[PDB]
Amino acid sequence: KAKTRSSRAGLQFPVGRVHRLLRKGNYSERVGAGAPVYLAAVLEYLTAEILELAGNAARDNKKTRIIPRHLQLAIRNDEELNKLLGRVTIAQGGVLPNIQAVLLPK
Amino acid sequence: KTRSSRAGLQFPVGRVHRLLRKGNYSERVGAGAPVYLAAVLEYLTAEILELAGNAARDNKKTRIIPRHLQLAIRNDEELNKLLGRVTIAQGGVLPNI
Amino acid sequence: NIQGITKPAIRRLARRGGVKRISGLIYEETRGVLKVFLENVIRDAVTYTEHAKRKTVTAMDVVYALKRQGRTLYGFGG
Amino acid sequence: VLRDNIQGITKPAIRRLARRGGVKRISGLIYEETRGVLKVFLENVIRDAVTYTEHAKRKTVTAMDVVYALKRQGRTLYGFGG
Amino acid sequence: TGGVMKPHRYRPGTVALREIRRYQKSTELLIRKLPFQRLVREIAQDFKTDLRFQSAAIGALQEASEAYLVGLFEDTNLCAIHAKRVTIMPKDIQLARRIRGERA
Amino acid sequence: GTVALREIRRYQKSTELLIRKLPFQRLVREIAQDFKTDLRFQSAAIGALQEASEAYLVGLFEDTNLCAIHAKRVTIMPKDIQLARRIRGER
Amino acid sequence: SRKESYSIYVYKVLKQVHPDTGISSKAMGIMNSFVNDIFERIAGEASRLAHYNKRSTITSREIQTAVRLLLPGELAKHAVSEGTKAVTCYTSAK
Amino acid sequence: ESYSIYVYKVLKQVHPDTGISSKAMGIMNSFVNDIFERIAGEASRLAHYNKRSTITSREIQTAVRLLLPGELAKHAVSEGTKAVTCYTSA
């Protein structure tokens, strides 16, 4: 039985698809064998982190639906994720609630 | 015999073609692309060197200095708009008080 | 139809940013900067479409132009 | 070993750099903040430069790596290759 | 003697802070769709006519423009707070654009 | 006040580097030491770092001067430094 | 013709990390765009960095170095560890 | 490799009596390489978008309009077009 490369490496992301996209995405004539596995693992870990924080942020809101609002909350409330995704605008994500201290009355 | 003489250019068309072929951008490169790219490079370099020579003449100098290149780039709206995120080594800053 | 960006709408946009008070002369300035930004993005999307041999600007051209200006947009097929 | 060397960036040097930028008066607390900013910037550039050297199995940092690294930070440098 | 006592008005800023919280909690588009669509068509008319604009392209443009304006107003609010004021003025807009690099 | 404008006029026309070479060299080596040991450095790499850091600091001081001018002051303060850095996007 | 997407795999990993939580279509679009953008960033950095050393191959080393160049902080280290774990797991099987 | 000779030729074309320092020569080489990289990379990106495998004069032209700003690009486009017909008529 021809087992998938994703099942061989214990990943959920498609190793074959990233291999095809690397080979067809005009980078270099030849692509090493370990590169799609490594890239798929990195993409998996990152999407796992984002979806985890988003599910938690939805959970504080007592919701079972992940919406762009929760994704924006998850991205902007984590320092390193905000550093990585600095220059991206999330559609229908909104803005984090932030009111300045001296803006308030006395 | 040379493509540069056929196109009336001083930049080497073959060099641009070789860089495009071995630069891993696409599988094939048309014949008009290196000629067009070489012409664009020649016009741009002629423009910036013209402004640098004008600035050097205004500064009573015979040799172009990176100070003159910085002055020529920063005094031109289109050029400094193109080169906003570029810092010229040994160029100094534009005099502004 | 630059006057179509009405005063309550731009007031709401400023209010989302946490601004408490608004000067009376600021509205023309915001209309101008919005016009400049829209002009640049629309120009880039239009020449992208003209290179693509099409007569209808699609969302992909817009997202492409925005991402090329360092303003990457998520959620529209990028 | 090198310990507490950032103070080698002297106060008149910061004065000269501010004079180049057109600053007329300088507060006394500017120098420590400027030293901190310079340290942060240098650390950011040096991290990428040393990563580029480590991948190439080299033991010396070359000028090309430093250019490539500042260009990767959006601070393209003309005059040192590229 | 059938008159009614009036509840008077709120202080300046109270309803402002309320609507600040309300708009920072919700995520809908704040610019009306049809005037924005007309404005985009007017700008696009100047280059080449007969250019159709998909609804998704107009929506993407609206989202990007709203994000840009919100970010600019946040920076301008920081500028105003820095100058010991609570009202933003066009000079703060110009300065924010200047330091951002958008204005030469 | 007069010599401040004299210093501005002198330094804005000059092109040589204003940061002293040897302390900057030792600073670069000290920073690079804690990422990897026994690191060598080309002289041109140190010169490129010096030029880039000087250009960045000059730009930061210019934007800080604009911020100081905004608040009806003539003296730059640290709050101007973090205001310029915050607006420019550094953290 | 059809158009490939990462929707099923994103749903699978969400069901792995949060069994009782679903996801809307718009959030699926954002996640797909995010995965695609990160893919382009890492692939382009690896292609450039490989072109610097006059090499024709993207190997695990180029991807690892690109990950260290892009990801900010501890995230990079965690990603690198898991990527190495995946490679040796692949190497341990056949 | 360097572009020294060609920059010397265009310099003596526009300014026969003006010299140039070595640091300015390095600056010119870096500038030409940077502009080449930008235009070629954007043209490749356009080729990738339109599902094309060939870089022709068209994608180069549109990359030139995309990158260079204002009148400059127009004159550059004109110059490139003239070069193409000059190539075609030789």
Swiss-Prot record, chain A:
Keyword Signal applies: no
Modification after translation, per record: It is involved in the initiation of both imprinted and random X inactivation. Ubiquitinated H2A is enriched in inactive X chromosome chromatin. Ubiquitination of H2A functions downstream of methylation of 'Lys-27' of histone H3 (H3K27me). H2AK119Ub by RNF2/RING2 can also be induced by ultraviolet and may be involved in DNA repair.
Positions bearing N6-crotonyllysine: K24, K106
Residues where N6-glutaryllysine is found: K83, K106
Gene Ontology molecular function: DNA binding; protein heterodimerization activity; structural constituent of chromatin
Primary localisation category: nucleus
Annotated positions of the N5-methylglutamine modification: Q92
Crosslink site: Glycyl lysine isopeptide (Lys-Gly) (interchain with G-Cter in ubiquitin): K1, K3
The entry's keywords: Acetylation, Chromosome, Citrullination, DNA-binding, Hydroxylation, Isopeptide bond, Methylation, Nucleosome core, Nucleus, Phosphoprotein, Ubl conjugation
Recorded superkingdom: Eukaryota
A GO biological process held by the record: chromatin organization
Modified residues (N6-succinyllysine): K83
Chain positions found as N6-(beta-hydroxybutyryl)lysine: K1, K24, K83, K106
Function: Core component of nucleosome. Nucleosomes wrap and compact DNA into chromatin, limiting DNA accessibility to the cellular machineries which require DNA as a template. Histones thereby play a central role in transcription regulation, DNA repair, DNA replication and chromosomal stability. DNA accessibility is regulated via a complex set of post-translational modifications of histones, also called histone code, and nucleosome remodeling.
Homology family: Belongs to the histone H2A family.
Name of this protein: Histone H2A type 1-B/E
Organism: Homo sapiens
Record lineage: Eukaryota, Metazoa, Chordata, Craniata, Vertebrata
Full protein stretch here: 14 to 119 of 130
From Swiss-Prot, chain C:
Outcome of mutating R11W: In TEBIVANED3; results in early developmental defects when expressed in zebrafish embryos
Claim: 4Fe-4S is one of the keywords in the record: no
Modified residues (N6-(beta-hydroxybutyryl)lysine): K7, K53, K67
Impact after mutating K67E: In TEBIVANED2; results in severe early developmental defects when expressed in zebrafish embryos
Cross-link (Glycyl lysine isopeptide (Lys-Gly) (interchain with G-Cter in SUMO2)): K7, K35, K55, K67
Placement of covalent cross-link Glycyl lysine isopeptide (Lys-Gly) (interchain with G-Cter in UFM1): K7
Residues recorded as bearing Phosphotyrosine in the entry: Y27, Y64
GO annotations of cellular component type: CENP-A containing nucleosome; chromosome, telomeric region; extracellular exosome; extracellular region; membrane; nucleoplasm; nucleosome; nucleus
Documented effect of changing R16H: Found in a patient with a neurodevelopmental disorder; uncertain significance; results in early developmental defects when expressed in zebrafish embryos
Subcellular location: Nucleus; Chromosome
Modified residues (N6-succinyllysine): K7, K53, K55, K67
Disease: Tessadori-Bicknell-Van Haaften neurodevelopmental syndrome 1: An autosomal dominant disorder with onset in infancy, characterized by poor overall growth, microcephaly, hypotonia, profound global developmental delay, impaired intellectual development, poor or absent speech, and characteristic dysmorphic facial features, including hypertelorism and abnormal nose. Other variable neurologic and systemic features may also occur.
Name assigned to this protein: Histone H4
High-level lineage: Eukaryota, Metazoa, Chordata, Craniata, Vertebrata
Gene: H4C1
Swiss-Prot record, chain E:
Gene Ontology, cellular component aspect: Barr body; chromosome, telomeric region; extracellular exosome; extracellular region; inner kinetochore; nucleoplasm; nucleosome; nucleus
Span covered, complete protein: 33 to 136 of 136
Effect in UniProt of substituting D50H: In BRYLIB1; uncertain significance
Protein task: Variant histone H3 which replaces conventional H3 in a wide range of nucleosomes in active genes. Constitutes the predominant form of histone H3 in non-dividing cells and is incorporated into chromatin independently of DNA synthesis. Deposited at sites of nucleosomal displacement throughout transcribed genes, suggesting that it represents an epigenetic imprint of transcriptionally active chromatin. Nucleosomes wrap and compact DNA into chromatin, limiting DNA accessibility to the cellular machineries which require DNA as a template.
Annotated coiled-coil segments of the chain: none
Organism: Homo sapiens (Human)
Residues annotated with Phosphoserine modification: S26, S55
Modified residue annotations for N6-lactoyllysine: K25, K48
Listed name of the protein: Histone H3.3
Sites of N6-succinyllysine modification: K25, K48, K91
Keywords: Acetylation, ADP-ribosylation, Chromosome, Citrullination, Disease variant, DNA-binding, Hydroxylation, Intellectual disability, Lipoprotein, Methylation, Nucleosome core, Nucleus, Phosphoprotein, Ubl conjugation
Phenotype when changing R9C: In BRYLIB1; uncertain significance; increased protein abundance
Modified sites of kind Phosphothreonine: T49, T76
Chain positions with N6,N6-dimethyllysine modification: M5, K48
Compartments, record wording: Nucleus; Chromosome
Effect of I81L: In BRYLIB1; uncertain significance
Positions bearing N6-(2-hydroxyisobutyryl)lysine: M5, K25, K33, K48, K91
Residues recorded as bearing Phosphotyrosine in the entry: Y10
Residue numbers of N6-glutaryllysine PTMs: K25, K48, K84, K91
Stated family: Belongs to the histone H3 family.
Swiss-Prot record, chain G:
PTM comment: Monoubiquitination at Lys-3 (H2BK34Ub) by the MSL1/MSL2 dimer is required for histone H3 'Lys-4' (H3K4me) and 'Lys-79' (H3K79me) methylation and transcription activation at specific gene loci, such as HOXA9 and MEIS1 loci. It also functions cooperatively with the FACT dimer to stimulate elongation by RNA polymerase II. Phosphorylation at Ser-5 (H2BS36ph) by AMPK in response to stress promotes transcription.
N6-(2-hydroxyisobutyryl)lysine carried by residues: K3, K12, K15, K26, K54, K77, K85, C89
Record cross-link Glycyl lysine isopeptide (Lys-Gly) (interchain with G-Cter in ubiquitin), residues: K3, C89
Modified residues (N6-crotonyllysine): K3
Localization per record: Nucleus; Chromosome
GO MF terms, alphabetically ordered: DNA binding; lipopolysaccharide binding; protein heterodimerization activity; structural constituent of chromatin
Modified residues (Dimethylated arginine): R48
Any GO BP: antibacterial humoral response
Residues recorded with modification Phosphothreonine: T84
Record-listed N6,N6-dimethyllysine modification sites: K26
Modified residues (Omega-N-methylarginine): R55, R61
Record family assignment: Belongs to the histone H2B family.
Protein name in the entry: Histone H2B type 1-J
Species in which this protein is naturally found: Homo sapiens
Gene that encodes the chain: H2BC11
